[PDB]
């Protein structure tokens, strides 16, 4: 989608004014912020800048869905605490926009770090349309125009360091008129890690995608679909169908009805574009979809207990996966090998997970991140992760995919 060499650790600052759109979203107990994972990242940019000696340092919010009621408190007082503790320099939380008080505060107290906003000022969104159900309405133009003007209001250089403004727009990624587009190391890492497989990386581009089911499932497919190294490990029932015939025929009949043409089709292009897509042949299937009463065999035999096929990546599947796994190429992993969360029908899967991460070094760098996999990662244990956990399980992917990426576009290379 682009993101060549935007900018990082490039901004010189120096008695300059810095506004940072970070990753400030956490649980919601009292204040007791359950999880500091998101906050930790902020630190490289946050600290570097925090002290460099600008004069500013406004680090924006973003965590919650102030649905029905208004701007409702449940702000970020505790977080400041988190910030204060880490920094030990003093963090002040004011307004996400203005407040006569707002313009005043930033200016007043020399160098500091101010965390303000989120999506309280229904202005960082685009109101919950569809009439009936929940009140208010989408739409809105200039009013937003003012908010944006107001927001930039006290800045110099704006640094995005979250996977938000790369699909949509939303506050902290647009309005912030005035040049200077600086992207935290985090953004930088993705683009770079993420960015190149995209370029001309020799080390093949060896591609690992588990489980069937599409959604952009399908969406996922086309973009992942174009690349470099023609190695994709995708496990689908029809493909199986497409590939041969009988497996599908007794197995059953239908996968993703649309997916059937598209899949055979995309798949074809894939051969042409690169070469090889690696599927099962050995699968394990059990009475229901759940996790109980299970059978593992290779290939042929399905029907009643099914109508799509078996489920989790089994022995055969494991090896091949592992098999390709061992073989340079970069390794990108989206969703579960399958149903990785229903033990029994989530074993081989870990098996795959291990080499990739392990390899990262050996083999080659590993970029896997999302939601489903994320779980996979946490449960198995990233432990060295060695590549990319591309948070924005979804956002990244589309992103991953090659689309333009909105937030990202805003970024150029400082200037
Ligand atoms: N062979 C399979 N047997 C059973 N369930 C499967 C199988 N393959 C895939 N699934 C389902 O597909 C999911 C795999 O993850 P999925 O394909 O949804 O990843 P993704 O689309 O890249 O990311 P996501 O889960 O956030 O947004 C499993 O969690 C499971 O619900
Ligand atoms: Mg999911």
How many whole angstroms separate alpha carbon 414 and alpha carbon 167?
21
Residue 279: CB partners within 8 Å, gap ≥ 6? 233, 234, 235, 236, 239, 240, 243
How many whole angstroms separate alpha carbon 39 and alpha carbon 37?
6
Provide the sign of the torsion angle of the four alpha carbons 333, 337, 338, 343, taken in this order: negative
128, 195, 260, 394: the catalytic one is: 394
* Residue 73, CA atoms < 13 Å, CB-side half-sphere: 4
**CATH, range 193-401:** 3.40.50.1260
Token pair for residue 370?
């999302």
Q: How many CB atoms lie within 10 A of CB 111?
A: 15
> What is the residue with the minimal CA distance to atom 5 of ligand 1?
339
- Classify burial at 212, counting beta carbons within 10 Å of its beta carbon; exposed 0-12, middle 13-18, buried 19 or more: buried
How many whole angstroms separate alpha carbon 224 and alpha carbon 288?
31
372 alpha carbon – ligand 2 mean position (Å): 5
CB 1 within 8 A of CB 140: no
Give the residue carrying structure tokens 């944006």: 148
First to last CA, the chain: 21
Taking the CA of residue 217 as reference, the ligand 1 atom at the shortest distance is 21
Please state at what angle helix 393-401 crosses helix 372-380, rounded to 10 degrees: 120
Token pair for residue 106?
């930033």
CB 61 within 8 A of CB 19: no
Q: Ligand 1 pocket, 339 CB below 6 A? A: yes
* Residue 52, CA atoms < 13 Å, CB-side half-sphere: 23
> What is the residue with the minimal CA distance to atom 15 of ligand 1?
335
Q: How many CB atoms lie within 10 A of CB 225?
A: 21
How many whole angstroms separate alpha carbon 308 and alpha carbon 289?
10
38, 148, 181, 189: the catalytic one is: 38
Q: Ligand 1 pocket, 312 CB below 6 A? A: yes
Residue 122: CB partners within 8 Å, gap ≥ 6? 66, 136
Binding residues for CDP are: 211, 216, 235, 335, 340
CB 354 within 8 A of CB 380: yes
The fold of 1-186 is: Rossmann fold (3.40.50)
Q: Where are the domains of the chain?
A: 1-186, 193-401
Pairing assessment for the beta strands 91-92 and 113-116 based on DSSP bridges: parallel
How many whole angstroms separate alpha carbon 101 and alpha carbon 405?
35
How many whole angstroms separate alpha carbon 404 and alpha carbon 13?
29
Pairing assessment for the beta strands 276-277 and 231-234 based on DSSP bridges: parallel
- Classify burial at 394, counting beta carbons within 10 Å of its beta carbon; exposed 0-12, middle 13-18, buried 19 or more: middle
Pairing assessment for the beta strands 295-298 and 282-285 based on DSSP bridges: antiparallel
Instruction: Give yes or no: 227 in active site.
Output: no
Q: How many CB atoms lie within 10 A of CB 12?
A: 8
CB 385 within 8 A of CB 357: yes
Token pair for residue 344?
């029994």
Helix H, strand E, coil C: the string for the chain is CCCCCCCCCCCCCCCCCEEEECCCCCCCCCCCCCCCHHHHHHHHHHHHHHHHCCCCCEEECCCCCCCCCCCCCCCCHHHHHHHHHHHCCCEECCCCCCCHHHHHHHHHCCCCEEEECCCCCCCCCCCCCCCCCCCCCCCCCHHHHHHHHHHHCCCCEEEECCCCCCCCCCCCCCCCCCCCEEECHHHHHHHHHHHHHCCCCCCCEEEEECCCCCCCHHHHHHHHHCCCCCEEEECCHHHHHHHCCHHHHHHCCCCCCCHHHHHHHHHHHHHHHCCEECCCCEEEECCCCCCCCCEEEECCCCCCCCCCCCCCECHHHHHHHHHHHCCCCEEEECCCCCCCCCCCCCCHHHHHHHHHHHHCCCCCCEEECCCHHHHHHHHHCCCCCCEECCCCHHHHHHHHHCCCCHHHHHCCCCC
How many whole angstroms separate alpha carbon 263 and alpha carbon 258?
8
Our CA angle for 328, 331, 336, nearest 5°, is 140
Domain 1-186 shares a fold with domain 193-401 = yes
How many whole angstroms separate alpha carbon 212 and alpha carbon 214?
7
Residue 357: CB partners within 8 Å, gap ≥ 6? 366, 382, 383, 384, 385, 386, 387
Q: Ligand 1 pocket, 31 CB below 6 A? A: no
Q: Ligand 1 pocket, 337 CB below 6 A? A: no
Instruction: Give yes or no: 38 in active site.
Output: yes
Report which of 143, 203, 135 is spatially closest to residue 175, judged by C-alpha positions.
143
Binding residues for Mg(2+) are: 212, 215-216, 372
Instruction: Give yes or no: 203 in active site.
Output: no
How many whole angstroms separate alpha carbon 148 and alpha carbon 305?
57
Please state at what angle helix 348-359 crosses helix 372-380, rounded to 10 degrees: 80
Report which of 327, 325, 330 is spatially closest to residue 201, judged by C-alpha positions.
330
What number of residues does the chain have? 415
How many whole angstroms separate alpha carbon 90 and alpha carbon 20?
17
Instruction: Give yes or no: 213 in active site.
Output: yes
Residue 234: CB partners within 8 Å, gap ≥ 6? 209, 221, 277, 278, 279
Q: Ligand 1 pocket, 212 CB below 6 A? A: yes
CB 405 within 8 A of CB 167: yes
Q: Ligand 1 pocket, 371 CB below 6 A? A: yes
Q: What is the resolution of this structure in A?
A: 2.5
Exposure letters 242-274 (e unless 16+ CB within 10 A, then b): bbeeebbeebbeebbeebbebbeebbeebeeeb
Which residues on adjacent β-strands are paired with residue 114? 58, 92
Question: What order do you get walking across the sheet with 231-234 strand by strand?
Answer: 276-277, 231-234, 205-209, 330-333, 366-368, 387-388
> What is the residue with the minimal CA distance to atom 31 of ligand 1?
339
How many whole angstroms separate alpha carbon 199 and alpha carbon 5?
12
CB 208 within 8 A of CB 324: yes
Report which of 343, 287, 288, 278 is spatially closest to residue 316, judged by C-alpha positions.
278
């Amino acid at each position: 989608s682009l993101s060549s060499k935007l900018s990082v650790q490039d901004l010189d600052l120096k008695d300059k004014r810095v506004f940072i759109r970070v990753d400030f979203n956490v649980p919601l107990d009292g204040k007791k912020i359950t999880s500091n994972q998101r906050i930790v990242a902020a630190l490289p940019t946050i600290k570097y800048v925090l002290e460099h000696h600008p004069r500013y340092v406004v680090l924006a919010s973003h965590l919650g869905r102030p649905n029905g009621e208004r701007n409702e408190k449940y702000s970020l007082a505790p977080v400041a605490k988190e910030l204060q503790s880490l920094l030990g320099k003093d963090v002040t939380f004011l307004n996400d926009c203005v407040g006569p008080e707002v313009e005043a505060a930033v200016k007043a107290s020399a160098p500091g770090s101010v965390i303000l906003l989120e999506n309280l000022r229904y202005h960082i969104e685009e109101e919950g349309s569809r009439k009936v159900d929940g009140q208010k309405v989408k739409a809105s133009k200039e009013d937003v125009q003012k908010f944006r003007h107001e927001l930039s209001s006290l800045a110099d250089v704006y640094i995005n360091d979250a996977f938000g403004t790369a699909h949509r727009a939303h506050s902290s990624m647009v309005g912030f008129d005035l040049p200077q587009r600086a992207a935290g190391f985090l953004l930088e890492k993705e683009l770079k890690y993420f960015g190149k497989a995209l370029e001309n990386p020799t080390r093949p581009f060896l591609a690992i995608l588990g489980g069937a089911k599409v959604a952009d499932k399908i969406q996922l497919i086309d973009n992942l679909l174009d690349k470099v190294d023609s190695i994709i490990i995708g496990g689908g029932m029809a493909f199986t169908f497409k590939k041969v015939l009988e497996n599908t025929e007794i197995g059953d009949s239908i996968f993703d009805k649309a997916v059937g043409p598209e899949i055979a089709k995309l798949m074809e292009k894939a051969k042409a574009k690169g070469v090889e897509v690696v599927l099962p042949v050995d699968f394990i299937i059990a009475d229901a979809f759940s996790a109980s009463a299970n059978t593992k065999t290779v290939t042929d035999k399905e029907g009643i207990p099914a109508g799509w096929q078996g489920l989790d990546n089994g022995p055969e599947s494991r090896k091949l996966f592992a098999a390709t796994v061992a073989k340079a190429t970069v390794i990108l992993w989206n969703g579960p090998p399958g149903v990785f969360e229903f033990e029994k029908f989530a074993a081989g899967t870990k098996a795959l997970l291990d080499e990739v991460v392990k390899s990262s070094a050996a083999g080659n760098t590993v970029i896997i991140g999302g939601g489903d996999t994320a779980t996979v990662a946490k449960k198995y244990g990233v432990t060295d992760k060695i590549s990319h956990v591309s948070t924005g399980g979804g956002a990244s992917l589309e992103l991953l995919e090659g689309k333009e990426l909105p937030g990202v576009a805003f970024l150029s290379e400082k200037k």
